[PDB]
Amino acid sequence: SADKVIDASGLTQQDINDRLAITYPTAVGLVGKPNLKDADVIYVQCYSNIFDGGDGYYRVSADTTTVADGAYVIRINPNLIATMLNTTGSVDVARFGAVMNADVSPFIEKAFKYFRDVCLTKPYKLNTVVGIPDQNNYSKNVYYLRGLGDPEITVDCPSAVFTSASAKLDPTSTVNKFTAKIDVSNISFIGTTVANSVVFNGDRLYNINVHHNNFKGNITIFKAYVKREVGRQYTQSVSINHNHLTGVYRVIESDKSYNLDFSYNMCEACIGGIYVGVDAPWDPNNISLTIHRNLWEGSGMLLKTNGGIIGGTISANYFENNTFNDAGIEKCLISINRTGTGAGYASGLVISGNTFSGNGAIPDFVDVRYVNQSTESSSTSKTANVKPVVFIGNWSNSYLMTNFAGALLINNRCSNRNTMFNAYSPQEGRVTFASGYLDKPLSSMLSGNLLNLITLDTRPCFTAGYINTNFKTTFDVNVLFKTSGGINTASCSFKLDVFVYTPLGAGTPPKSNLKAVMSAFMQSDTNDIISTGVNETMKSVIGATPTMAVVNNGDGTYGIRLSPFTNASSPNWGAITSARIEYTYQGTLIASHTSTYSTANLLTIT
Amino acid sequence: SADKVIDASGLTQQDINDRLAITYPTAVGLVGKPNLKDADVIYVQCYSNIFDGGDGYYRVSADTTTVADGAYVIRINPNLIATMLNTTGSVDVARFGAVMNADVSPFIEKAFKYFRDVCLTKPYKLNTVVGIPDQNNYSKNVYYLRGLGDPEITVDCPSAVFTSASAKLDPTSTVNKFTAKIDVSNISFIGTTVANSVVFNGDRLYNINVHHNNFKGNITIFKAYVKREVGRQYTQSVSINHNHLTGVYRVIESDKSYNLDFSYNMCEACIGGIYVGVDAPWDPNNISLTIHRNLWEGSGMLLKTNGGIIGGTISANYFENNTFNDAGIEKCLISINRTGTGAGYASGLVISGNTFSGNGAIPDFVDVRYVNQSTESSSTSKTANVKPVVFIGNWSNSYLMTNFAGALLINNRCSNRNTMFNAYSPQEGRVTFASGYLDKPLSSMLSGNLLNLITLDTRPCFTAGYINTNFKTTFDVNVLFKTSGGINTASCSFKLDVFVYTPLGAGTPPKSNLKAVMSAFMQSDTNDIISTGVNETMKSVIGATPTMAVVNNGDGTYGIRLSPFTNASSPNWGAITSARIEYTYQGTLIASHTSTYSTANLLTIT
Amino acid sequence: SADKVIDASGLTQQDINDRLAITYPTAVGLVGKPNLKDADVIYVQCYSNIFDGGDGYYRVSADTTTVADGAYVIRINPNLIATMLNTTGSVDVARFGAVMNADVSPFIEKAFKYFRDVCLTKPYKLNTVVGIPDQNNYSKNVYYLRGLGDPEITVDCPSAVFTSASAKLDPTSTVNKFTAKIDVSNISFIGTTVANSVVFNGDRLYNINVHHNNFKGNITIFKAYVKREVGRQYTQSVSINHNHLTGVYRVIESDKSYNLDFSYNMCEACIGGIYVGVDAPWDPNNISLTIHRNLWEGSGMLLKTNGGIIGGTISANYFENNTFNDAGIEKCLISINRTGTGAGYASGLVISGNTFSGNGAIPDFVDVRYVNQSTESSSTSKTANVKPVVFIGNWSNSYLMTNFAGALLINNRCSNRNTMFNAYSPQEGRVTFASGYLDKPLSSMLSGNLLNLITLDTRPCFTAGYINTNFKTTFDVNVLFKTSGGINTASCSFKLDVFVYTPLGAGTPPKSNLKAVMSAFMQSDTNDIISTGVNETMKSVIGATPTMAVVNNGDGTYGIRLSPFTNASSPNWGAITSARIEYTYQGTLIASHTSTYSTANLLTIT
């Protein structure tokens, strides 16, 4: 007996025996084993071979009934089994029989059937299709697949590796055999042949967050296969963010794409990017498309369609030296066309803060080809069924940023801006606009038949820079004259051109000066009716030959006086007592003897 | 004795004994134990029950003095204790006594008191309030709470589960009882009753990054409770990014919100989103608000306020089919109002690249209701105390995108654009603007009393498309005439209307042609003073009836010649020798016989 | 013998012996050891001291030849060694001999030589330079360095801690001694002296994602050192996102920076931010620069340059109370200057949705100083070699947002907007623009010598609000007259001013009314040539004194009738049969008796 025995501690060999664990070499080695009971917890030092790991706890229970898959439940003998206990929360795929440098695909498939978080720590190959437990985009759960150790996964499979459990069974059902809610992280995927390097199935994976991974050589990250939406393939709620990419064949290949994201990636020497609605365009062919904050350098075309893009953001990217593959052929980094049966216009697309450089190798690189987007055949500017791209605060030193005149350009630095038909903003072209109103008792305006309508005051202009105080202004002035009861019995309107000047090159002058010309005088008359019932007309308060004088008030303010004014009265409503004066002006901002602009903003109307 | 014994190795049973570890079943089982000494390191196979895990190392020390909490320090006997050793860096909550499917709340509270990274690997329930060690937003540290295994956490608590250690003690102090710097990740939170499913306390948690989690059923992710800032609740520096969301009752409920982020989430069939300043609006009621790059589909209202939003970005989102709950009632996805005591205007809000679709079910869906934002009562356009939303390159097929005329619209694709009073840009309405200057020795201009002022050159127009070379241009020309010493003794200004035409439908014509009309001629005169001291005036250099001729130079260039010009001289300064010519034009861009625009950009002024 | 012995189980002490693991205390303790064979797998309970951890598996092999580093391979004796087995995938640095509160730098250097994922779980100090295995930005691999337990790392090193293996050897080579592809996460870095707290080397680390960490006290996150690009240092593809920051001395210090990102950080009481091209500016000195969605509060200057920024986004940030350090000196949060040899202009910079508040302490805070950016010396507005910043839907209550008049302002809420020379948009200043065309058989227009050119229709205006139906419109109308064979034999052009008025303050009137004035009439004449060959001219179809009448059609529609019209015919081509009518208008939108705008958008041209 053992208690009789004495360890060199001075301890009973029994009192040792008690502080001791059941440990076996291999998981698969449990089948043999005697001398194990229900409630026994055992520690297996690896699954198969040690260089492959797979270590973890089992629990032995008394089990007659339940069949045994061969990893999660192992039959020790006819009436005893071991079930796998997960400790680390996330589970090595090794624990399921995954072997270093082999096809890990059956093993990932196996593991996900028992667990939701599953992790690779060893180099593997993916040669077969992984199906993934089916759940909808309303599910309680999120399948994770994690990288610890930066596992180097070689991709080599005739299909897209990853699919739904269901669709793996019928890979071709045009029935929506989909799985959602997946997170893939911290893995270096490594490609083989182009044809064999497709990682995810777009037909089949929705709501997938692919983040902080690494892709290398001839990988296609997502492919679509089956025509399933009026003759089109589609993908849905795919997001690729914070990955490195190198040599990548395609970021995504599909007919259509819903809700696709490509953010904060670092992509070197890739072949191609987002090829969507290329062969088979559609009217909406990308519906939400985000390309934010990537590096994409020394590379091919980043985006290529033949169909419409809807609700697109291409922001804060860095694009250096993209003269390769399709980019060198087509001489552009983004190529938006519309051609082929189904193909629609791009609409609602913002392109901002991107850097487009070093495409110098191609003397005629266009950064963003936008072809067949004309809708100049439409007879008005007033509808917005179709709206072209707006580009904003980008920077390009390529030959052209874009070739479509109807692209809206807002403060883009670009070569050959004065080649391009695109509209210049009033801001670039140093033009400003203001508007306001005055309400004025007539009492205060009327002098004989002179209506002292408005004062222009150039003191704010002078104050702020007498040099800058040289500008032309053009005003629309609309006057609504009102009876005491506030009935508009008379109205008139006129353009006014105003020139504000202050002599330069002799030091501070006494003041600024002002001239004005009126034109395009119009007013209400007795043919314009207020009430047919009680027989009431509008009137004409200005007489034969409208006359405007500029009154020089000698300190930098100017009255605009309007002549022959006559009051008219209604039996009902009385005479006019007051006027509402609505002014809208545009001013010249150039002030070419300074560093800055003209004081036109500061011209005051009282 | 043991060395006498012989294992079937041919090894001394003592030489075995030596390569062996102290292992016990349970952590709580250490209390009993004899035959343990100071420096002893022991391996416990689980805390309580095995199905719950909790396994890790202890160290036994000789300890008389220190009291024992019951997990981190366990009393083996009066003079011996075991302290917990953390290996995995992040610590299972199991190791503290957390049990599968129970309230994990005491256990999370316990663990965080000893460790900063704490991790859930087992399904649990949260039924009680977790307080969290108090630290300020200037702290050395970041509390993490991690998900391994996608743990399914059921939320069922009459308060917001997570709070500050302090505020858990007085849940109502209007004193700022806050904790900052928290990271929560990789967990599926699962809701019960609406009333019981609030996860985080906004009053109490600042600087919290909630990322790559999952929320399901009637969760409110954040609630605010106590009025604490002039009658308002507030939250601060909350960020929710890369989560899935499904059935979510509210993303956030509060009076006010500082610095709140909602990025790259995937949200299906949610009830409601960001309800802020709804019951109790305020003037700033959301101060920084980011809603970037989410999926939000088949859902309720995404954002609803009654107070002002300040510094808002709603970008690159995909919004399909949001006709539910409050969205179906109020017939909008975002509902910005101003009403109720305190309520202010929205100001500084950019909404770009969003996709707003399939709200067809409600024939009169408005995407963004913006109600009571009028400030048209203000008498000028010149102040920016209040500034409305700018919408830019979005896409909507809803009945209206918005209902406020003062929203700025830049290249949004939307239905009924010609319903809406919003200003059309000069770019949409095919108008362009340019400006420049010439400096010219008079010597080169003056011929008799003809001032050959400027040349217009339509060769650049013709070169680039003789068809497109049909446009009207309107120029403001300001001329500052200067003495040799560069004193501005004379100035004049005029409008010029220029029509550029090239006959179509007969092949390439010899050239483009040009006509012009001058108007709104004004000039300086002797009443405008340069120096009162030395008695110096401005002059008038153009005589009775200003006359402009267009000179046809026969090759596509045109002189603009100004008539009666007479020099004037100052005793001091001499005659005029040179002029500075400042031009500002606007041109028509429509060119309705082509696909493109008019050559107006390319008209050259020399 | 052992099988003779009997454990209190009733089990043969041999049948125990068999279910048992080889366990030693310490890794370093293996050297002594006898009684171990090839294939033996052993479990070491810590590396050195237990409080430091380091526990993991070795494998014993028979080894004569290979030398032993002292952690990964340990010599047990002349012909036996132990190699380290990695289980957890990511490897504790402890396993390499890292000790609590010491310089972990040699140990990180050691570990990365064997593994790519390496993790800190214990407080340490970084006192020496860590070199990092050299790989290019096209590499199969990504070095990770992880945080578990929120390890508190003190930084205290006379160089930047982290560098390339190569550059650690020659720290000064102007040769491009770089390493790429690194991920650093979940660590609290803690600073000492400013001079000693630099974490990463910009010269040497490319493609580095620094995310979800914590920085505290006098840390400089990145420094550049060596002049290496035409007298400049540079950094490349650095991204700092989702960190906390507190007390941070500099986010980045460099001459130049390529492709730099600063996203979703939470930064409190920092000293300074992105100091780039300060001492030594350059023409492009930041090439791609993203500052998105940070908190930056109670802090110093966030960005400071003296060189050009190219392709910049500063979006959705919250900036409260930034009155400190350099911010209080220079009285600004961003300070973009151009000065010192090499220095260029900022170009292509979008600043949107930021919140700039509580800088009240400095009565004259400018949020974004933009100094020496004038390029008003350029003679046209038409080139875009240089383009200034565009600011859009930000919010500021600082004294000024910016001080450069040439910044483009789009719907920014800001103080003193009517101080600033920046152009007001036509939209703010309540101006709208539309354009279209009509094609019309002359047959339908011509009546005697009256050309009934176009109808204006104010019914759409009235329908939508008879109060708002008071506006001035100014139209450019260009008419291209065409022979049956569609040859443009005649053309004319005119301005038209149109006043649309409807009397207010008496209930719904019968209709809206309309007046118009024509001006700036021009037409083709026989001097304009179609074909010199076959001797063909353009003609004049309007006679002595062009006359336009407004025809009141009595229901809210108005003909514009043009007078003396005469047909002209070509021998070749016949008479004119049809005209193409191109209209471009601008309208006043103010409608100061309502909450909204004028109906000008809805005026219809048929």
Numbering used by the authors:
A (entry chain A), B (entry chain A), C (entry chain A): 155 to 760
What does the paper say about this structure?
The capsular polysaccharides (CPSs) surrounding the A. baumannii cells are the primary receptors for bacteriophages encoding specific structural depolymerases that determine the initial step of phage–host interaction. The genomes of Friunaviruses encode only one tailspike depolymerase (TSD) specific to a certain K type or several K types with similar structures or linkages between K units. In the obtained trimeric structures of the TSDs APK09_gp48, APK14_gp49, and APK16_gp47, each chain contains a particle-binding N-terminal domain and a central β-helix domain, as well as a C-terminal domain forming CPS-recognizing/degrading parts. All depolymerases studied were specific glycosidases that cleaved the corresponding CPSs by the hydrolytic mechanism with the production of monomers or/and oligomers (dimers and trimers) of the repeating K units.
APK09_gp48 structure has an N-terminal four-stranded β-sheet domain (residues 155-270), a central β-helix domain (271–568) having 11 rungs, as well as a C-terminal nine-stranded β-barrel domain (569–760). The latter domain of APK09_gp48 is about to be perpendicular to the long axis of the central domain, which is in contrast to APK14_gp49, where these domains are almost aligned along the same axis. Finally, rungs 5 and 6 have four strands, B1–B4, with B3 and T3 being faced toward the three-fold symmetry axis. APK09_gp48 crystallographic trimer has a diameter of 65Å and a length of about 140Å. Each subunit of the trimer has an interface area of about 4462Å2 (17% of the total subunit area). The trimer is dominantly stabilized by polar interactions, including a total of 204 hydrogen bonds, 36 salt bridges, and hydrophobic interactions via side chains of V504, V544, I546, L562, and I564. The trimer has one cavity in the central β-helix domain. However, the moderate resolution did not allow us to model most of the solvent molecules in the APK09_gp48 structure, including the intra-trimer cavity. The enzymatic activity of TSD BS46_gp47 has been studied earlier. Both APK09_gp48 and BS46_gp47 cleaved A. baumannii B05 CPS by the β1→3 glycosidic linkage between the GlcNAc and GalNAcA residues of the neighboring K units. In our experiments, recombinant TSD APK09_gp48 significantly inhibited A. baumannii-induced death of G. mellonella larvae.
